[PDB]
Ligand binder design. Structure first.
Ligand code: F4K
Lengths: 105, 89, 16, 149
């Protein structure tokens, strides 16, 4: 089916979906249309594992059962600045505050 | 498709399909005229969940499939409630 | 005479 | 005489409640005067055979909170005559709640009603929290919407 993703680089997060049967290269083409950087200037990651262009998302471990709309799977993204690819770096979101007393048991 | 960019209070940028962002009645009204939207009042741990709700609502509306619960951790519920009230979704 | 719904004494089953 | 009520058809109809939701489900039968009656609850992910009747009206709610649920994608379920012995399926599911009403559900589950107005939230939300789901108020709304059509 479809997998629901968050493509993340630095302080940028792209929400998109793709078919399990679509390829990493195809996903790079999606990012190209949004961030205006071509596929050979991109590297995609599942955790620390760099994803090969010719593999499908299902073959990389992304499954519709776990990559759902309300809980999308994270794909890491890194850009090639000039000659070299940057190291993969995703900044965490903000930290939720302490639960108030009347919401604690 | 077309996309819009939503910016949270700590500078996180969230790029979502424009159709999905129109889930918010507030955003729909802002963009309804004949993109980038700043929400410096909403922190990233809330706005990211808002975008997840957009995806969820578009997917499961008018569907016969079994609908999964939309999960909300206790520690974000108060801020997410205020964000949902303000965004009208 | 009014006939209300009722439940046969039978085990429930699990959905998957 | 109420618009939403079962008809005393006395014609048996076998039905299978399928709780395809994560909630404990309360089946609610509208009697012949339109008054809602509770039936034994259904754990999440479980099914049950029911002996019902043609033209009876059913609706379904979360048993603990009375949050509204859907049955075959709509509010009310009406058994039909069994064709070739096959029972009629009532597939109970969550609706797509608005994010606001889903947030209210979570807050209600964690905060005693006497403590709602202690939360540091915008004032209009106090009344939203207090306006908890209610079967009879929903029946009155569904009735009015039906008349409009
Ligand atoms: O929160 C949405 C919602 C509210 C009420 C119902 N509802 C179930 C039986 C009658 C009404 C269903 C969904």
């Amino acid at each position: 089916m479809d997998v629901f993703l968050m493509i993340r680089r630095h302080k940028t997060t792209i929400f998109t979906d793709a078919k399990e049967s679509s390829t990493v290269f195809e996903l790079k083409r999606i990012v190209e249309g949004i961030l205006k950087r071509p596929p050979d200037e991109q590297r995609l990651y599942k955790d620390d594992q760099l994803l090969d262009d010719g593999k499908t998302l299902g073959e990389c471990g992304f499954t519709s059962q776990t990559a759902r709309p309300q809980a999308p799977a994270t794909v890491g993204l890194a850009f090639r600045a000039d000659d070299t690819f940057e190291a993969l770096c995703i900044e965490p979101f903000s930290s939720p505050p302490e639960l108030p007393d009347v919401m604690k048991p | 498709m077309m996309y819009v960019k939503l910016i949270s209070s700590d500078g996180h940028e969230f790029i979502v399909k424009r159709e999905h962002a129109l889930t918010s009645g507030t955003i729909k009204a802002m963009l309804s005229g004949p993109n980038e939207v700043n929400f410096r009042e909403i922190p990233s741990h809330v706005l990211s969940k808002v975008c997840m709700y957009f995806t969820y609502k578009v997917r499961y509306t008018n569907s016969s499939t079994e609908i999964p619960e939309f999960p909300i951790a206790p520690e974000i519920a108060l801020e997410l409630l205020m964000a949902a009230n303000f965004l009208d979704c | 005479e009014a006939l209300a719904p009722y439940i046969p004494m039978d085990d429930d089953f699990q959905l998957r | 005489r109420p618009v939403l009520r079962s008809v005393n058809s006395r014609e048996p109809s076998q039905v299978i409640f399928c709780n395809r939701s994560p909630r404990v489900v309360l089946p609610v039968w509208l009697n012949f005067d339109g008054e809602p009656q509770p039936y034994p609850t259904l754990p999440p992910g479980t099914g049950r055979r029911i002996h019902s009747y043609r033209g009876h009206l059913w609706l379904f709610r979360d048993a603990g909170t009375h949050d509204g649920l859907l049955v075959n994608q709509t509010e009310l379920f009406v058994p039909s005559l069994n064709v070739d012995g096959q029972p009629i399926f009532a597939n109970i599911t969550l609706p797509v709640y608005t994010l606001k009403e889903r947030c209210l559900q979570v807050v209600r589950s964690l905060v005693k009603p006497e403590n709602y107005r202690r939360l540091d939230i915008v004032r209009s939300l106090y009344e939203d929290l207090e306006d908890h789901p209610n079967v009879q108020k929903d029946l009155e709304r569904l009735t009015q919407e039906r008349i409009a059509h």
